[PDB]
């Protein structure tokens, strides 16, 4: 069988979807989820609707899970002639943490670290998290008030590289590398429907300069205003290019190359973007070898997007975009 | 090997007469052809087959095989590994009475932060003291400490800052257990153990909190009778080293007397505490004897080494067991482990300020023999640095 | 919306359970000289739902087994935890999640057998007392039942007869418990809410034996091996492995009469 | 009633189940002439396979190896090289997976005793010159000088050491599964080795010191071990005349290895008791 | 880990890779070629190999073996199946005293016929009763019913030929085990290890012929905890009751002393019976004191409360340990949970009729001290008021 | 002297350490009685107790071999120290078998 | 899910002779007249290891290749790196490792033929130190 997909919005094996599209992704902390129901209306029977507006699920893909988070919205349709369709759309379960407000009491966390801090700003909603890089310290951390569930994790992951994003069950990983698990040598000739790879130059940079300043405790003047800085390089772009991406917490020595790295590991996975077109319906972070001989490359990548497709008609394909081999 | 492996030559010629018998119908074979080579080959193959078959049988042998199917082993016959602990304890806080308390009390002690264990009361109680068991926030080695005093982080109106650690200590935590000591616990299950409620008692009492180590009677605590001819002890008694808490981790008799009590029960023998029934006893306790270890020589080295040698003779004599003697060979080893066999090196082993303490006495030879009770205890290591070094000046 | 008819529902089971717990469970109101023992019979049953996570977890290195390890002790070591149902409920039914979530399927089979084995007594004391015990012994028996009627069906069926002998196991289980909850009314209503569940459990173990794979008995002239065998059945001789759990017999010699899927 | 036979946990009483019918197929089924011919099955279907393994003859030579017998109208054809692969494969299988099987139980091993006695740590009682006093004032395989004993390190025959080893082996796998230290279980535990501890006193003792035990034999032979499949465990003597085996004269006349394992082992069972002998009889077959 | 039967695809293709490299040079292998069913075969062989070698290693798992490879493989541990087993009870027969009593002997009761489990005198006692354990000749569960009057099939002269059961109760019958309540119990006898404790003694006793409950010694018993010269408890003493059986629940010496028989053994002391080596010991029974108890003032509670009160009162007597004062504030709090503290519920302890009883005293406080070997029974429980209130208008 | 009272493997493994630090000794190089205390000092740990002596067969003399004031054995050039036997003694008593 | 057959995979090679190294490896547990040798034998390989990669590297002139041999010599200089065997054979293979990267394919052929060469003898002590050897 070429079944891929069984909904459920709760139970409910999903038999009607006239579509759908299944977006997961590394640059963002959820997913995208959308389906499309018939949903008939006969104007002198009865008719049932489900006002669910948050009411749970996931997609099985290929028998094996790949979403888990019709919260979204409902977005009934109406025409003369194609009428009656009803769009259901369903972010990852790490949403709230994207459209919430932080309601932790004190705002200020002393003499903690950053995976503690993260675990109190997501068990207010109860995700739990996957945490798989490091522990990192830091003396001060006082949120803004009210800011964001997501922008303060996202800040607090990216001065100290942990890339931020969510799994198939329903969790929340921070993870500093990859997801192992190699895979399919997607060869040309092979099974890439279509192909695009665009390695520019406006989003490189030869040396980042972070600056910033110290905020242990006692430590001042010099030692807190002049001394930190670093200069990390990419021995791989070219002429000078410099920058300076200052710093937010506690620069540290190992704080200001960490961040410097990220953001040399950010435009450097940018510089060499692929989009490949497959056929047939697990690569979130996977790396595949892939043979593209006419643009030159015979090298290792990481995907970083996943997005699989259907319509009955014309369809079942799965777009992929992969990370550079430096 | 624990198969067979038969000789090389006698399955090669095994293998090429049943070639000969079955194919070519009895007929030699011509070397260098087809048939030779097709005939080696099988052999690698059966080689191999031999080799798989061998660690077929190996990876079902508790002492090597893969960790993961060693635990999968163990867990079949009741061996479980240990999980990491998380430090333990009881704080005093006190307060205007009548204040409002919730979940999120967190302590300072030191460097390390704690929480309460226990469900936290709504409100103080009217005495103005509360008394909470606190566990550490991070699992392993780090959240046991000595301390007396500590702050409130999180702050409380009407609470006032100063909390006391109640008992002025905090056990329990320990890390994960590895691998191979889990190997080597799980080995120690299925052999053949006599005396078997010695280390039974002795793996028992190692589970009091804040008990380090447990070592057996010492060597010179053995005993005679007239006729000359060992005594064997009709009881079982250990010694237990606490040495987190108190100086060299001797404890007061008191301590060692309420884990007795707790082993054994009251009155021993009788099945009411841990042990079996009819199973009596005695835990015991040590008096120090307080030692000056000096090191002479030790400045040609390089700084490395001198430092590594400081640390591993600090080591050894602070894990020293009681009833045992210190002598000038064991710390000379040390020395020379690490400095070569072609280095000069000399340590010397005194009583501070040359008094005489009970339990020690210096034999010629130069060791420190010390009597029953008693454990040697590193006043201070002191090393001689007479300017000399590599290149004169 | 279709229905769900492969997969078990333990929700109201659950409530039900909780139910007829709470009602039968009140160490406030039980002569004085039993609540220590019904208590410590509360806690003996923690206990071992205790050892059956640390057996069934074992190579789980992660902080949240080193969490879920912490959070057990410091509820047994309490002293005033389990004199309230709630508490006592709460601890019993997240204990039992806890350890569904540590394995899948095969796993926890041994130790869900034990536990049921473990609550399979009766208790001594009279009057409030002996039915303050046996709603514990109760509770365990039945959510041990569910959450194993939940573990047969993550795995697949081997054998028409083996799916029948497991769904026969769990029915008679429950049958007992529901004439134990019958037995002089005890209580009605939780004699219903176990038939019910009975029922429920009875279609989708009996789906999963018949239908999840459509096991068929082939029948091949003479035994033949099991390449041979698979690649005739299937048209591909690598599914030759799937042949081996199901017929018994050696590799070279499967048959005459050969269990396997539909084609 | 019920007639209890022994047990890990005393005199439990026994039963039988039914025959299921389902246990695969096991080593001993498999022959080569069995699944050589067998294994002409692998081969296509046609005219050019049809004749051929119609023909397909076997006959045992004289070592094993089920050979395909030429006779003078042979066809050399792929078919008796799939005999061949069939006569190997159960030649391998019975040389390298029977092994390695039958080593992986204590109560099976067959080459590998001693390989078992350094995982269970047996450590001898008798062969060490540091020995208990209370082990008695001469064991049977010391001789005497002027300053002491001398113990002398006995190199049993190998049919002899392999049942002896192979007997102790089990009885330390039926002990270390934790037996209670009753009369019954310790019996049950060292009758591998043909040997059973019978009290000595008939009144209620639990008043009177000495409460000993002698040591009675229950065959003169070790129950040995098969390295076949199909057969019988060979028995051997479990003793050794002394003037055969050319020993000093100081030593007994008869010594018996599994009688030193059983005392060891029951000495260590009961070293917490503190009153307890164990009277030792020269014992002759 | 480590090493695994390989895909089939990957054994293939290395089994080709290495056919065409060490023979054909390197050349490809042709399809429906010589050299390409020759590659097939081997292939086949090494499938065969692997999958026979999974299967035997399956085989000698107890959590999958084929049953009759699990009936041994476990009883050369010692683990057999346990069979159907026979109900056991008491009788008690009466008879011209003197008569000759036979050891064929055999009872009636109902659709059962039950014969004696010990040894039968050879005449009948000078009383003219004797009770007996009996066990049913069939097993199976329907051993175990509920009839108290019973027939002696083979008349004896000068014996009654109506013998009575002893509470009509007949316990202890059960049947056999199946091939998976099998695989329990074995498989789980392999992570126990068994220990002799005072609970192991306690819940062994318990497995006699209706012994509801066994209590220790208590207070007022004295006990000698070692005989013989020794150093370590070897004497531990018990108190079976059968409360459903016997008249109070106490048994008469006839019974505990074949308890006793048969737990610590025939010559005690040697390790004959279920107790360890060398621990003698003894289960005593105790006799009945009779106790009157006076609640006044429970006669103006609501009847609901009075019912509960008698209820608890009773039950809370029956099973009062022996050799155990019943102090008058442990029945007095009975009264306060259920009635509350505004309540006016006084509590008397008397003798029946005054009565003068062996082993009882009163104390100053009212306390009904008993002497050990004695059991406070309860003859019957009495409700009056004295003290006028205004309960009533 | 005091080795039979440690497992047997323990005084196998000193045994074979022994045997062969002997036979590699380099010539005209005393055979000093603190080279081989440590041989048993590694295994059997500081707890145990483990005394060493060397002696001459059957106390005969040799050219070229001393004995020092610590009963260490001195060697002359052209002299190397060959092993004759190495044995096991236990005259110490202890409670290690009871 | 086609596999390049273009190419060898030394992911498993490698870590088989990483257990197979720790397996026979532990200079704790060698007689204590031998473990100077045991060890001096680890930093002559890792000598040989360093040569190879200056022999490789010619004319190489960014500042990895000035950081590469401070590691290097930083690395032999210590005393007690080598007797871990953690560290051992972290060395080892980054070492071969960075002997890879430093050029390719001709380039590296005599270098690594010379190692085979050197790695190409016996242990002449006995036990357990042969067997480290």
């Given at each position: 069988?070429?079944?891929?997909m069984?909904?459920?919005?709760?139970?409910?094996?999903?038999?009607?979807?006239?579509?759908?599209?299944?977006?997961?992704?590394?640059?963002?902390?959820?997913?995208?989820?959308?389906?499309?129901?018939?949903?008939?209306?006969?104007?002198?029977?009865?008719?049932?609707?489900?006002?669910?507006?948050?009411?749970?699920?996931?997609?099985?893909?290929?028998?094996?899970?790949?979403?888990?988070?019709?919260?979204?919205?409902?977005?009934?349709?109406?025409?003369?002639?194609?009428?009656?369709?009803?769009?259901?759309?369903?972010?990852?379960?790490?949403?709230?943490?994207?459209?919430?407000?932080?309601?932790?009491?004190?705002?200020?966390?002393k003499?903690?670290?950053?995976?503690?801090?993260?675990?109190?700003?997501?068990?207010?909603?109860?995700?739990?998290?996957?945490?798989?890089?490091?522990?990192?310290?830091?003396?001060?951390?006082?949120?803004?008030?009210?800011?964001?569930?997501?922008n303060?994790?996202?800040?607090?992951?990216?001065?100290?590289?942990?890339?931020?994003?969510?799994?198939?069950?329903?969790?929340?990983?921070?993870?500093?590398?990859?997801?192992g698990?190699?895979?399919?040598?997607?060869?040309?000739?092979?099974?890439?429907?279509?192909?695009?790879?665009?390695?520019?130059?406006?989003?490189?940079?030869?040396?980042?300069?972070?600056?910033?300043?110290?905020?242990?405790?006692?430590?001042?003047?010099?030692?807190?205003?002049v001394?930190?800085?670093?200069?990390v390089?990419?021995?791989?772009?070219?002429?000078?290019?410099?920058?300076?991406?200052?710093?937010?917490?506690?620069?540290?020595?190992?704080?200001?190359?960490?961040?410097?790295?990220?953001?040399?590991?950010?435009?450097?996975?940018?510089?060499?973007?692929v989009?490949?077109?497959?056929?047939?319906?697990?690569?979130?972070?996977?790396?595949?070898?892939?043979?593209?001989?006419?643009?030159?490359?015979?090298?290792?990548?990481?995907?970083?997007?996943l997005?699989?497709?259907?319509?009955?008609?014309?369809?079942?394909?799965?777009?992929?975009?992969?990370?550079?081999?430096? | 090997?624990?198969?067979?492996?038969?000789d090389?030559?006698?399955?090669?010629?095994?293998?090429?007469?049943r070639?000969?018998?079955?194919?070519?119908?009895?007929a030699?074979?011509?070397?260098?052809?087809?048939?030779?080579?097709?005939?080696?080959?099988?052999?690698?193959?059966?080689?191999?087959?031999?080799?798989?078959?061998?660690?077929?049988?190996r990876?079902?042998?508790?002492?090597?095989?893969?960790?993961?199917?060693?635990?999968?082993?163990?867990?079949?016959?009741g061996?479980?590994?240990?999980?990491?602990?998380?430090?333990?304890?009881?704080?005093?806080?006190?307060?205007?009475?009548?204040?409002?308390?919730?979940?999120?009390?967190?302590?300072?002690?030191?460097?390390?932060?704690?929480?309460?264990?226990?469900?936290?009361?709504?409100?103080?109680?009217?005495?103005?003291?509360?008394?909470?068991?606190?566990?550490?926030?991070n699992?392993?080695?780090?959240?046991?400490?000595?301390?007396?005093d500590?702050?409130?982080?999180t702050?409380?109106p009407?609470?006032?800052?100063?909390?006391?650690?109640?008992?002025?200590?905090?056990?329990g935590?320990?890390?994960?257990?590895?691998?191979?000591?889990?190997?080597?616990?799980?080995?120690?299950?299925?052999?053949?153990?006599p005396?078997?409620?010695?280390?039974?008692l002795?793996?028992?009492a190692?589970?009091?909190?804040?008990?380090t180590?447990?070592?057996?009677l010492?060597?010179?605590?053995?005993?005679?009778?007239?006729?000359?001819?060992?005594?064997?002890?009709?009881?079982?008694?250990?010694?237990?080293?606490?040495?987190?808490?108190?100086?060299?981790?001797?404890?007061?008799?008191?301590?060692?007397?309420?884990?007795?009590?707790?082993?054994?029960?009251?009155?021993?023998?009788?099945?009411?505490?841990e042990?079996?029934?009819?199973?009596?006893?005695?835990?015991?306790?040590?008096?120090?004897?307080?030692?000056?270890?000096?090191?002479?020589?030790?400045?040609?080295?390089?700084?490395?080494?001198?430092?590594?040698?400081?640390?591993?003779?600090?080591d050894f004599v602070?894990?020293?067991?009681?009833?045992?003697?210190?002598?000038?060979?064991?710390?000379?080893?040390?020395?020379?482990?690490?400095?070569?066999?072609?280095?000069?090196?000399?340590?010397?082993?005194?009583?501070?300020?040359?008094?005489?303490?009970?339990?020690?006495?210096?034999?010629?030879?130069?060791?420190?023999?010390?009597?029953?009770?008693?454990?040697?205890?590193?006043?201070?290591?002191?090393?001689?640095?007479?300017?000399?070094?590599?290149?004169?000046? | 919306?279709?229905g769900?008819?492969?997969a078990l529902?333990?929700?109201?089971?659950?409530?039900?359970?909780?139910?007829?717990f709470?009602?039968?469970?009140?160490?406030?109101?039980?002569?004085?000289?039993?609540?220590?023992?019904?208590?410590?019979?509360?806690?003996?049953?923690?206990?071992?739902?205790?050892?059956?996570?640390?057996?069934?977890?074992?190579?789980?290195?992660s902080?949240?087994?080193?969490?879920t390890?912490?959070?057990?002790?410091?509820?047994?070591?309490?002293?005033?935890t389990?004199?309230?149902?709630?508490?006592?409920?709460?601890?019993?039914?997240?204990?039992?999640?806890?350890l569904?979530?540590?394995?899948?399927?095969?796993?926890?089979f041994?130790?869900?057998?034990?536990?049921?084995?473990?609550?399979?007594?009766?208790?001594?004391?009279?009057?409030?007392?002996?039915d303050a015990?046996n709603?514990?012994?109760?509770?365990?028996r039945?959510?041990?039942?569910?959450?194993?009627?939940?573990?047969?069906?993550?795995?697949?069926?081997?054998?028409?007869?083996?799916?029948?002998?497991?769904?026969?196991?769990?029915?008679?289980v429950?049958?007992?418990e529901?004439?134990?909850?019958?037995?002089?009314?005890?209580?009605?209503?939780?004699?219903?809410?176990?038939?019910?569940?009975?029922?429920?459990?009875?279609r989708?173990?009996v789906?999963?034996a018949?239908?999840?794979?459509?096991?068929?008995?082939?029948?091949?002239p003479?035994?033949?091996?099991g390449?041979v065998?698979?690649?005739?059945?299937?048209?591909?001789?690598?599914?030759?492995?799937?042949?081996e759990?199901?017929?018994?017999?050696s590799?070279?010699?499967?048959?005459?009469?050969i269990?396997?899927?539909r084609? | 009633?019920?007639?209890?036979?022994?047990?890990?946990?005393?005199?439990?009483?026994?039963?039988?189940?039914?025959?299921?019918?389902?246990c695969?197929?096991?080593?001993?089924?498999?022959?080569?002439?069995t699944?050589?011919?067998?294994?002409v099955?692998?081969?296509?279907?046609?005219?050019?396979?049809?004749?051929?393994?119609?023909?397909?003859?076997?006959?045992?030579?004289?070592?094993?190896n089920?050979?395909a017998?030429?006779?003078?109208?042979?066809?050399?054809?792929?078919?008796?090289?799939?005999?061949?692969?069939?006569?190997?494969?159960?030649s391998?299988?019975?040389?390298?997976?029977?092994?390695?099987?039958?080593?992986?139980?204590?109560?099976?091993?067959?080459?590998?005793?001693?390989?078992?006695?350094?995982?269970?740590?047996?450590?001898?009682?008798?062969?060490?010159?540091?020995?208990?006093?209370?082990?008695?004032?001469?064991?049977?395989?010391?001789?005497?000088?002027?300053?002491?004993?001398?113990?002398?390190?006995?190199?049993?025959?190998?049919?002899?050491?392999?049942?002896?080893?192979?007997?102790?082996?089990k009885?330390?796998?039926?002990?270390?599964?934790?037996?209670?230290?009753?009369?019954?279980?310790?019996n049950?535990?060292?009758?591998?080795?043909?040997?059973?501890?019978?009290?000595?006193?008939?009144?209620?003792?639990?008043?009177?010191?000495?409460?000993?035990?002698?040591?009675?034999?229950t065959?003169?032979?070790f129950?040995?071990?098969?390295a076949?499949?199909?057969?019988?465990?060979?028995?051997?003597?479990?003793?050794?005349?002394?003037?055969?085996?050319?020993?000093?004269?100081?030593?007994?006349?008869?010594?018996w290895?599994?009688?030193?394992?059983?005392?060891?082992?029951?000495?260590?069972?009961?070293?917490?008791?503190?009153?307890?002998?164990?009277?030792?009889?020269?014992?002759?077959?």
């Open positions: 069988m070429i079944k891929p069984r909904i459920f919005i709760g139970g409910e094996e999903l038999v009607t979807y006239t579509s759908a599209q299944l977006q997961r992704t590394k640059k963002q902390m959820t997913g995208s989820l959308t389906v499309e129901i018939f949903l008939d209306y006969v104007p002198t029977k009865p008719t049932i609707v489900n006002a669910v507006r948050g009411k749970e699920i996931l997609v099985y893909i290929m028998g094996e899970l790949a979403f888990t988070g019709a919260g979204g919205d409902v977005s009934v349709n109406f025409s003369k002639g194609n009428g009656y369709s009803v769009t259901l759309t369903a972010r990852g379960r790490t949403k709230y943490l994207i459209d919430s407000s932080q309601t932790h009491p004190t705002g200020f966390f003499n903690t670290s950053d995976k503690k801090v993260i675990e109190t700003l997501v068990k207010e909603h109860n995700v739990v998290l996957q945490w798989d890089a490091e522990e990192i310290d830091e003396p001060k951390v006082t949120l803004r008030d009210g800011n964001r569930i997501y303060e994790i996202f800040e607090r992951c990216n001065q100290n590289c942990h890339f931020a994003y969510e799994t198939r069950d329903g969790k929340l990983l921070i993870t500093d590398g990859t997801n698990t190699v895979g399919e040598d997607i060869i040309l000739g092979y099974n890439i429907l279509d192909f695009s790879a665009e390695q520019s130059e406006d989003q490189a940079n030869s040396q980042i300069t972070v600056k910033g300043h110290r905020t242990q405790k006692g430590v001042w003047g010099n030692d807190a205003i001394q930190p800085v670093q200069t390089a990419d021995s791989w772009v070219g002429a000078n290019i410099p920058l300076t991406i200052q710093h937010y917490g506690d620069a540290t020595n190992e704080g200001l190359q960490r961040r410097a790295k990220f953001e040399a590991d950010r435009r450097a996975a940018e510089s060499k973007s989009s490949v077109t497959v056929f047939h319906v697990w690569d979130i972070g996977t790396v595949h070898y892939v043979e593209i001989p006419p643009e030159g490359i015979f090298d290792v990548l990481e995907c970083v997007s997005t699989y497709t259907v319509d009955a008609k014309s369809t079942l394909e799965t777009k992929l975009e992969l990370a550079p081999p430096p | 090997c624990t198969i067979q492996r038969p090389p030559q006698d399955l090669r010629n095994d293998i090429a007469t070639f000969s018998t079955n194919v070519l119908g009895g030699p074979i011509i070397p260098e052809s087809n048939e030779f080579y097709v005939v080696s080959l099988e052999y690698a193959m059966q080689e191999e087959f031999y080799a798989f078959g061998e660690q077929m049988w990876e079902r042998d508790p002492r090597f095989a893969c960790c993961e199917n060693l635990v999968k082993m163990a867990a079949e016959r061996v479980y590994p240990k999980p990491a602990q998380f430090a333990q304890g009881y704080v005093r806080m006190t307060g205007t009475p009548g204040s409002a308390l919730n979940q999120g009390l967190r302590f300072q002690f030191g460097n390390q932060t704690y929480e309460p264990a226990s469900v936290v009361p709504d409100q103080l109680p009217a005495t103005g003291i509360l008394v909470l068991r606190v566990s550490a926030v699992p392993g080695p780090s959240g046991n400490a000595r301390v007396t500590g702050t409130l982080v702050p409380v009407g609470i006032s800052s100063a909390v006391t650690a109640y008992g002025g200590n905090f056990c935590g320990s890390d994960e257990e590895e691998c191979e000591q889990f190997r080597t616990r799980y080995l120690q299950r299925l052999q053949y153990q005396r078997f409620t010695v280390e039974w002795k793996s028992k190692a589970e009091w909190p804040c008990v180590d447990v070592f057996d010492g060597p010179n605590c053995c005993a005679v009778n007239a006729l000359g001819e060992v005594v064997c002890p009709n009881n079982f008694e250990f010694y237990v080293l606490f040495r987190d808490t108190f100086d060299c981790g001797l404890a007061p008799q008191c301590v060692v007397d309420e884990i007795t009590d707790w082993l054994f029960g009251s009155p021993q023998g009788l099945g009411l505490g042990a079996e029934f009819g199973i009596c006893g005695k835990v015991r306790t040590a008096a120090p004897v307080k030692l000056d270890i000096i090191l002479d020589g030790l400045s040609c080295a390089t700084p490395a080494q001198s430092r590594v040698v400081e640390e591993r003779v600090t602070n894990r020293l067991p009681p009833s045992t003697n210190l002598t000038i060979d064991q710390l000379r080893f040390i020395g020379l482990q690490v400095l070569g066999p072609s280095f000069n090196f000399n340590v010397a082993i005194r009583s501070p300020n040359d008094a005489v303490q009970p339990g020690l006495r210096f034999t010629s030879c130069g060791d420190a023999e010390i009597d029953c009770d008693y454990k040697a205890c590193l006043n201070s290591v002191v090393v001689i640095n007479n300017n000399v070094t590599t290149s004169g000046c | 919306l279709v769900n008819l492969v529902a333990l929700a109201p089971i659950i409530t039900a359970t909780e139910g007829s709470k009602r039968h469970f009140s160490p406030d109101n039980i002569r004085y000289y039993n609540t220590e023992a019904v208590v410590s019979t509360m806690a003996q049953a923690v206990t071992q739902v205790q050892n059956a996570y640390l057996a069934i977890s074992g190579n789980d290195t902080q949240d087994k080193w969490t390890v912490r959070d057990f002790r410091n509820v047994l070591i309490d002293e005033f389990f004199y309230s149902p709630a508490n006592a409920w709460n601890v019993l039914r997240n204990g039992f999640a806890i569904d979530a540590a394995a899948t399927g095969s796993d926890k041994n130790v869900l057998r034990n536990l049921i084995n473990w609550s399979s007594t009766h208790s001594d004391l009279d009057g409030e007392s002996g015990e709603a514990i012994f109760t509770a365990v039945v959510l041990s039942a569910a959450y194993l009627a939940k573990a047969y069906t993550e795995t697949a069926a081997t054998t028409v007869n083996e799916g029948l002998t497991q769904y026969d196991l769990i029915a008679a429950l049958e007992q529901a004439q134990i909850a019958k037995d002089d009314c005890h209580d009605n209503e939780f004699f219903l809410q176990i038939r019910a569940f009975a029922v429920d459990v009875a989708v173990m789906n999963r018949y239908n999840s794979p459509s096991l068929i008995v082939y029948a091949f003479g035994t033949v091996h390449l065998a698979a690649w005739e059945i299937f048209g591909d001789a690598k599914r030759s492995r799937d042949l759990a199901r017929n018994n017999g590799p070279w010699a499967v048959g005459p009469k269990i396997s899927e084609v | 009633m019920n007639v209890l036979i022994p047990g890990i946990d005393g005199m439990v009483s026994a039963g039988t189940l039914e025959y299921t019918g389902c695969p197929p096991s080593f001993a089924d498999v022959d080569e002439c699944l050589a011919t067998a294994f099955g692998l081969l296509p279907s046609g005219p050019l396979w049809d004749r051929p393994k119609y023909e397909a003859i076997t006959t045992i030579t004289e070592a094993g089920c050979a017998c030429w006779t003078t109208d042979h066809c050399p054809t792929l078919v008796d090289y799939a005999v061949n692969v069939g006569a190997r494969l159960a391998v299988i019975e040389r390298t997976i029977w092994p390695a099987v039958r080593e992986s139980d204590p109560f099976t091993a067959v080459t590998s005793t001693a390989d078992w006695l350094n995982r269970f740590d047996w450590v001898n009682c008798f062969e060490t010159s540091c020995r208990s006093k209370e082990l008695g004032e001469k064991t049977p395989i010391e001789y005497m000088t002027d300053c002491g004993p001398v113990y002398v390190k006995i190199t049993y025959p190998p049919s002899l050491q392999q049942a002896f080893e192979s007997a102790l082996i009885s330390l796998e039926r002990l270390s599964m934790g037996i209670i230290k009753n009369l019954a279980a310790i049950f535990v060292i009758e591998p080795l043909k040997v059973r501890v019978v009290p000595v006193d008939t009144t209620d003792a639990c008043e009177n010191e000495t409460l000993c035990v002698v040591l009675e034999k065959s003169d032979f129950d040995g071990v098969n076949n499949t199909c057969g019988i465990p060979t028995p051997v003597a479990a003793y050794i005349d002394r003037d055969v085996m050319q020993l000093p004269s100081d030593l007994d006349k008869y010594i290895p599994g009688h030193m394992a059983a005392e060891c082992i029951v000495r260590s069972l009961l070293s917490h008791v503190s009153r307890f002998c164990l009277i030792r009889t020269e014992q002759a077959p």
